């Protein structure tokens, strides 16, 4: 899977506007799924179906109020909208978290990307964090452009406990479609900013 | 050689408390040896430590920018590096190695090649932890991430006294008896 | 204070020699060589666990030199008070005939990080290399560790000859089995 193909798949996959509906009800809840009534946003009888692992698929339950933030993998499907994870306990009080970050490029000098990304939730999904950082990286470093040098790199989510969680930046499994690329988000993994220390970026070539 | 020397030391230091619960960053500009300029998280801006360093303090403090980068080192620098080395520094353990040899008879217990420096050495006689009449070299830095220390026991021989050593790299206390 | 990591760097004149390094809880995690421009691990194995862009340290050094000039003047040209080094020669392990060992010559509490160390067996100088870089002391002085692997005997009498602009005469240290 020559990186050359990896890259374009990501570029194309990630050139997208996320679904970002705030404080919506959960109509029903199963395992694989979780129904959310995005009625006060899109339209009459519309909604959002978030696909997610069992573990995660069971913490939420009907009537629940939640925040959606997911990258789609299918469209023009009537009244429905489908994503993987992207669900966190709704945020009630306004907040703002300027993220701190280091940008190491194999070859160039250290550079830091502090306060260049702002999260507006206390509890957030790695999806949401992963998305914005990538979008930023794209918008300025063109990390997925056919011409971009970078042959590889990753994201490290630094916690205050002193640990890092990797998130490969050039990884296109299977066919390499938004469905393949965006299904790792099933785990609906989240994080509490009280524990987010900083993030690190690594780019080779 | 009578040519004078003019030195300039810079120390960027990180202090960790309870793992990485709460850290502290501190930058120290040092001309020759006097710490003239400073900067402490607990403070937030550069402070002068000696008149010689004020000119700079006011300067850098005028660049809000550069001052945010330093304010964020407890995160992007300290906790980070702590965690980048974690695996081979804080979690480093290296089993000692004790031997016994006679220096009022003489006894000397040598604890070599261990790490960390937190360690405890004991002198027992048949059935008692004789804590009296024993000099020690204290903990000594070797330069290669390993320490050493010698505890000198002072008694008259006859029986069988032994060195008991317990260090964070071995749950079951290590032992070495000396036939007297 | 459970642990402290220190990024210690200096620049001296007219020697025009810098040094950059990380000190963890006491030891040198690693240092950058201004000569070969290559990060050098105190423990060769560390490199397998982490990397550090050597080029980076040299940048600072550049800056540091400059600060020296700009500070040298500002201080109305006042040099550095030589501060003698307190030598000392311990042993890597309990000496025991023929069984390989190491003589350590711990130089500590000196400040102009400039020194000269010579090893002596019987009397004639002995060479290969083996030494650390100027480690820092909470009082901004220095301590350096020099090494020499020897094969214990009783005939030989080793010597660590420390030369510093502190003592008006070289500093010698004797050592031998028993």
């Amino acid at each position: 899977k020559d990186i050359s193909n990896v890259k374009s798949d990501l570029l194309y996959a990630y050139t997208i506007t996320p679904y970002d509906y705030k404080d919506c009800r959960v109509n029903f809840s199963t395992t694989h799924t979780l129904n959310i009534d995005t009625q006060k946003y899109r339209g009459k009888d519309y909604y959002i179906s978030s696909e997610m692992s069992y573990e995660a698929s069971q913490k939420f339950k009907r009537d629940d109020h939640v925040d959606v933030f997911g990258l789609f993998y299918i469209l023009n499907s009537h009244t429905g909208e489908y994503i993987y994870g992207g669900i966190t306990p709704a945020q009630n009080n306004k907040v703002n978290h300027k993220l701190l970050g280091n940008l190491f490029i194999s070859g160039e000098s250290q550079q830091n990307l502090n306060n260049k990304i702002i999260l507006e939730k206390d509890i957030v999904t790695f999806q949401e964090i992963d998305f914005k950082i990538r979008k930023y990286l794209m918008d300025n470093y063109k990390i997925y452009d056919a011409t971009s040098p970078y042959v590889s790199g990753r994201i490290e989510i630094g916690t205050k406990d002193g640990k890092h969680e990797q998130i490969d930046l050039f990884d296109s499994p299977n066919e390499g479609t938004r469905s393949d690329i965006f299904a790792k988000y099933k785990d609906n993994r989240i994080i509490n900013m009280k524990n987010f220390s900083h993030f690190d970026i690594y780019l080779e070539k | 050689d009578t040519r004078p020397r003019f030195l300039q030391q810079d120390k960027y230091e990180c202090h960790f408390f309870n793992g990485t619960e709460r850290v502290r960053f501190l930058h120290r500009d040092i001309y020759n040896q006097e710490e003239d300029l400073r900067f402490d998280s607990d403070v937030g801006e550069y402070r002068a430590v000696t008149e010689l360093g004020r000119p700079d303090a006011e300067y850098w403090n005028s660049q809000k920018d550069f001052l945010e980068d330093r304010r964020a080192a407890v995160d992007t620098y300290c906790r980070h590096n702590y965690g980048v080395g974690e695996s081979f520094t804080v979690q480093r353990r290296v089993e000692p190695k004790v031997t016994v040899y006679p220096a009022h008879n003489l006894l000397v217990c040598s604890v070599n090649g261990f790490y960390p420096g937190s360690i405890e050495v004991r002198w027992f006689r048949n059935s008692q932890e004789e804590k009296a009449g024993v000099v020690s070299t204290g903990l000594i830095q070797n330069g290669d991430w390993t320490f050493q220390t010698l505890v000198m026991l002072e008694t008259v021989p006859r029986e069988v006294y032994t060195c008991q050593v317990e260090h964070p790299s071995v749950t079951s206390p290590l032992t070495v008896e000396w036939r007297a | 204070e459970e642990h402290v990591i220190i990024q210690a760097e200096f620049y001296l004149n007219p020697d025009q020699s810098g040094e950059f390094m990380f000190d963890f809880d006491g030891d040198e995690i690693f240092h950058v060589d201004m000569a070969k421009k290559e990060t050098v691990w105190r423990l060769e194995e560390f490199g397998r666990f982490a990397s550090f862009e050597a080029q980076g340290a040299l940048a600072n050094i550049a800056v540091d030199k400059a600060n020296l000039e700009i500070m040298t003047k500002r201080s109305n040209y006042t040099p550095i008070t030589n501060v003698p080094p307190e030598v000392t020669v311990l042993t890597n392990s309990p000496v025991e005939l023929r069984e390989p060992n190491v003589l350590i010559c711990f130089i500590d509490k000196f400040t102009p990080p400039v020194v000269n160390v010579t090893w002596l067996r019987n009397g004639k100088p002995v060479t290969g290399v083996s030494e650390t870089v100027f480690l820092p002391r909470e009082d901004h002085l220095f301590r350096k560790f020099h090494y020499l692997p020897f094969l214990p005997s009783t005939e030989d009498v080793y010597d660590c000859r420390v030369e510093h602009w502190g003592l008006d005469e070289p500093l010698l240290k004797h050592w031998e089995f028993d």
């Binding site: 890092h164 690190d200 690594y202 | 960027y12 080192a73 992007t76 980048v84 | 666990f49 982490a50």
Partner: peptide, 10 residues
Amino acid sequence: VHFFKNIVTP
């Protein structure tokens, strides 16, 4: 692999 980060001196 990981990278030790140094405080850039301005």
